[PDB]
Amino acid sequence: EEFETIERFMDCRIGRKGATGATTTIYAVEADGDPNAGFEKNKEPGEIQYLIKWKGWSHIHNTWETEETLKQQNVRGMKKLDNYKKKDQETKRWLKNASPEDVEYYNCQQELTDDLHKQYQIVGRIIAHSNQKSAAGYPDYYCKWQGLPYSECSWEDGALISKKFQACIDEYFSRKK
Amino acid sequence: EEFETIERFMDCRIGRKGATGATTTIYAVEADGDPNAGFEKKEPGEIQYLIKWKGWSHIHNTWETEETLKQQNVRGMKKLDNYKKKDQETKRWLKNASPEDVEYYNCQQELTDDLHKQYQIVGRIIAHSNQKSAAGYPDYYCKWQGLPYSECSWEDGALISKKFQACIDEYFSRK
Amino acid sequence: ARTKQ
Amino acid sequence: EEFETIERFMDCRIGRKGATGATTTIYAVEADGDPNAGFEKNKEPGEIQYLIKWKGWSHIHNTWETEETLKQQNVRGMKKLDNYKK
């Protein structure tokens, strides 16, 4: 409690300046547009940003951040930024002069894992709901995440889940509430 | 020296007392037998957890008990409490889970567990060091199956060749 | 439940 | 048409205060949602609760209770409580 904690670095990119924070969650983007929309890194120019999996928040809540925003919000786990950068550099140096095949394998694997990670934000199954309900009549939902074991299930705001997973919600009640 | 620290809880089981620690890594098992082999239920049990360590690749996971953990001063104990109530939460739910929910739960845990085993498999060697083992081996930068390049790690030579020699020989193709 | 408001 | 009786203590937990009784049955939870949904100790008022298997009722009727709830309902088998507390 009392400050957020970096749990894992999921990705890295150069995007528009200021396209970080809450407005970068997949649901914020789906509901209000990607603040990094139409960013042709080609004439802009951007800044180094990192996609963060936060401690205690499901992958649906991942946000893009910079070394600066991280520091600004006094997040814990900053040491992980240093390791990530060093590992990243090591990886670059070791792939410096690498056969086309080596580059081939690398790009392939990175896509496999990139896709895998995207599934972590998709509800595979609703498992239960809350007795309490929001003022708007939404109960929270216990979600099973695609690609992750049941130990990663988490309760999620009903309104949020309904905006994209109304099907899972419907099927949940259909198998008899 | 000083201390190891818990990163993730990969699993838990009821296993032979004393069947924890270094001798429980896949390569320890593979080289000297499994301390929990033929555990019976005719013998005293013990709740054990499969730990992923910060700074070590999955190949190095070991089973541990709440006790061996605290008897080593491991960091991250707080996570143990979360995993615990989490586990009981799913055990309670399991007691009344509809048959079709149980089935789904089982198929999904199968996949999950298989994915996890891949992490201990070398998918390709990316580089090696010049320094050689006190006679014999150089270390290898390994790209693990199922995991992104950000998780590549340097591993003791020999320890890798004892199982992924093929991947090592392949690597050798500057020519 | 909490969201990134 | 008298008192209910505890046949066995099945489980124990720290849960949202008030998350006990009838709304705690497996069928109530499945129909109206779990009253203990997303609870977290020290993040809100919690209580020690015990999962109770009732005499004369299959396990689907089991309910979470507090020493206080057991007492004001006048259930028999309170000795079960004492023993469990150790």
- What's the rounded Cα separation, in Å, for the pair B10 and B58? 10
Q: How far apart are the CA of D16 and the nearest CA of chain B, in angstroms?
A: 14
Phi, psi of A66 (to 5 degrees): -120, 170
Say if residues A20 and A67 touch (Cβ distance below 8 Å). no
Contact status, residue A6 vs residue A55, Cβ threshold 8 Å: yes
Tell me the DSSP string of D21-77. SGGGSHHHHHHH-BTTTT--TTSS-EEEEEEEEETTS-GGG-EEE-HHHHHHHT-B-
d(CA B12, CA A134): 36
Would you call D13 and B96 a contact, using CB atoms and an 8 Å cutoff?
Answer: no
Determine how β-strand A63-65 pairs with β-strand A47-54: antiparallel
Specify the 3-state DSSP secondary structure of B62.
Answer: strand
Host H or E run for residue D16: strand D6-16
Integer Cα distance of B151 and A87 in angstroms: 8
Region for residue A117 given its phi and psi (left: phi exceeds 0; alpha: psi -120 to 50; beta: otherwise): alpha
Taking CA atoms, A23 is separated from A20, A30, A34, A72, in Å, by: 7, 10, 8, 17
- Rounded distance between C-alpha atoms, residue A70 and residue A73, angstroms: 6
Experimental method: X-ray
Do residues A119 and A62 both lie within one domain? no
- Indicate the residue among A56, A72, A98 that finishes a domain: A98
Domain check: are A19 and A79 in the same one? yes
Amino acid, res. A167: A
Q: Identify the three-state secondary structure at position B85.
A: helix
Which of B28, B35, B20 lies closest to B68 in space, CA to CA?
B20
Q: Which CATH number fits domain D1-86: 2.40.30.10, 2.40.50.40, 1.10.300.10, 2.60.120.620?
A: 2.40.50.40
Contact A114, A157 (CB under 8 A): no
Residues of A with CB under 8 A from a CB of B: 9, 84, 87-88, 90-91, 94-95, 99, 102, 105-106, 109-110, 113-114, 124-125, 127-128, 144, 147-151, 153, 175-176
**What span, in angstroms and rounded, lies between the C-alpha atoms of B23 and A107?**
36
**Chains C+B touching (3+ CB pairs under 8 Å):** no
Report the residue of chain D nearest B92, measured CA to CA: D11
d(CA A62, CA D32) in angstroms, rounded, equals 31
Residues of B whose CB is below 8 A from D11: 88, 92
What are the residues facing A129 on neighbouring strands?
A141
Which three-class secondary structure state does DSSP give residue A126? strand
The angstrom resolution of this structure is: 2.4
Q: Are residues A1 and A87 in the same domain?
A: yes
Residues in D whose CB is inside 8 Å of some CB of B read 11, 13, 26, 51, 59-60
Taking CB atoms and an 8 Å cutoff, what residues of chain C touch A160? 3
CB under 8 Å to A124, separation ≥6 — which residues?
A143, A144, A145, A146, A147, A168, B108
Q: Which two tokens stand for residue B154?
A: 């340097």
Note whether A88 and A113 are same-domain residues.
Answer: no
